[PDB]
Design a protein around this nucleic acid. Sequence first.
RNA 1: AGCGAAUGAACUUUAAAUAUGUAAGAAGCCCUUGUUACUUAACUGAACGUGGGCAUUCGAAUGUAUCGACACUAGUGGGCCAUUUUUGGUAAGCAGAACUGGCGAUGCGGGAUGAACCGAA
RNA 2: GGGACCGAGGACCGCGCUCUGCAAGGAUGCUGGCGUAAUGGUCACCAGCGACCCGUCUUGAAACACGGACCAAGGAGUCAA
Lengths: 50, 174, 99, 126, 62, 52
Amino acid sequence: FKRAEKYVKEYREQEREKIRLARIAKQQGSFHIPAEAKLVFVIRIKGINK
Amino acid sequence: MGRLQEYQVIGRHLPTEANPNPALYRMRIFAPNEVVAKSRFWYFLRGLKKVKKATGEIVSVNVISEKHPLKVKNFGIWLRYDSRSGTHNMYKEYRETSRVAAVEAMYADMAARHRARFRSIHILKVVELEKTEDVKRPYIKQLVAKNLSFPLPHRVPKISTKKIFSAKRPSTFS
Amino acid sequence: RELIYKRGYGKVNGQRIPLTDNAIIEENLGKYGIICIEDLIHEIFTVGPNFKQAANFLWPFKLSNPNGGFRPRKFKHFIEGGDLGNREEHINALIRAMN
Amino acid sequence: RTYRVGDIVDIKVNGAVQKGMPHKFYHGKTGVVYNVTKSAVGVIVYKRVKHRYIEKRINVRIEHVKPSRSREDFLRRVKENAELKKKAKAEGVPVQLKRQPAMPREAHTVSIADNKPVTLAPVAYE
Amino acid sequence: MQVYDIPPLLKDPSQGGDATMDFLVQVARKRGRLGRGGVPNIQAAAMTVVTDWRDGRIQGWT
Amino acid sequence: VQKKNPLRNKQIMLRLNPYASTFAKEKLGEVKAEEGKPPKVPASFKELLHEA
RNA sequence: AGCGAAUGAACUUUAAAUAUGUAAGAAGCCCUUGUUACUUAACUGAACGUGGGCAUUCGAAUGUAUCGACACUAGUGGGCCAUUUUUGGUAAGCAGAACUGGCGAUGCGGGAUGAACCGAA
RNA sequence: GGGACCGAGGACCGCGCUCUGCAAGGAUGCUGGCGUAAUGGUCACCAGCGACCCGUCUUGAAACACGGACCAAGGAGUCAA
């Protein structure tokens, strides 16, 4: 119960932190570059012929 | 090419020890989505400079919405397209409402008259013609005529396709 | 979340066991610190050190065909109106249809 | 150059000497020396047929063979890890002794001052 | 919880008997000390915490 | 005996995740943004957005 | 790409695309010392080992529905077509080489039809 | 909110929760007609769609070629060293 409590709080804080950093860069004159993604979901959609 | 949007793409070569704080190039790209706009950026930067996706990074991608999407404008598009003979120049005018709509109108027009593809068309300049005298083509000129008004002869009525049989013959006047 | 909760199966002694209990997560990944579904979801999303053990524990996901189809022709790249290749966040629209 | 039976050699096939040159398949190869003669060296190479590898033995002269350094990276790592492990145990903190693949780049900000971006057309006109 | 995260410890039978087995696992998670099969280095995570306590990385008083 | 989906069955979701009740009651999927006066777009940003 | 670096495909700081050879630790080591008819001016080197440790990430990733050795037994040992790379020639055909894919032992959906097409076993 | 297909197992045990029991380790409750060709099955025919005539031989494969009027009975890797 307490593990799931801190996971929900962390996800909300991580989402808001990306928004706040992008905002504070735009008003300081700079550009905030978000981190490249660490997770990829790969789906195989084509047959194995040829 | 679909419901295009204008994108402001800014990218740069990866910072190194020899050259920190790199060049920071910027382009305006009409793309269907975010992912296409990055790809057209690196394709166009590869032809110009020696900057590719492997040694470069995207700094910002922003959507350039129209200032006034409710005001009718005359647009001028200068473009190059590739045919079997080679590369040619055109300048075409489009009476539209938004800069993206003029680009959609251009892509359908080049596909219709000249069978040009998206991979062969290079858009160089999309310019709003501020004054009426800047319009050069006669098909836009008759649209900007003073006291323009015309009827609509031979208007086929909108009859539902499931109405196979009709009792009285339709009229093409109103 | 939808992939783990709906199509989440575990490798237990070479067998495909559905993740219907928090216990069978604890028997298999409890030494790594993972004791329930939320820790498994946290580990995949926020890529932790035990990602290799948690991802290999999951059986490969048997997705259905997407609701609404792929596209008019799906063997071109995504940047020319196809389906093959990399898409940033449009894979989430694909995953929603295949779930 | 002195060669021993068992080391790893690279075949280059120089065009100056037409004697003892192997086939173009054996050009740019790498194998293990099994026999050393006065002017030629027998090298055991691997060739793939469908799924397996059939070992083939070719006689290559001195003028086309040279030592490699593929192993040299492995021995450079085996001392660098050894000194690092002894130096870590000396003061008592762990150190990542492995090599890890390159990771995705983290987030950062880029200032626009002094580096105002330049707009570029699809083709260059000047 | 504010320093090395540590999602909360499963208490198990008794108190502290098995909780600090789980603490060494969770510290090795946040530090990144695992095994070939991924088994966390509980002992190196423990000596990390003791060293961090000696350096003053964790507050505490009597 | 049969796999019951926690997205559709509320009892299975509470079995796997006891915080799903507190998530719904506290409305943690409907959290409003923090208060604050939003400062305007700088003029240098708009000029670069419409440079060409 | 540059020659506001030098020099001039045969120029280079750098470096594509495309496939390709070899190596990545427990069989490697490191520290102490036993043998040898090999070797060295020599308790010097080369091979095999004894004693301690690196056994918890043990020295990239990903996977692994196991892998190796010996003995024994049956059917096999023909090619056709296509992509790409390459060699030679003709008015045009065409002929040779390497990899890979399809068919031979394969049903199903599509291309009106069907050895060589697309989708998919 | 509106539909479609399915009800697999057979005392209790488990994981849980909206609590005088629950939707939580697979369908029960109430009701109607009939209780016989009614459901079900087997042939014959029509209808919609599908569908080369078998074997042998050659070959990368087809094509050609050969055998085939029909039925009953007999008919071909056995024994010994």
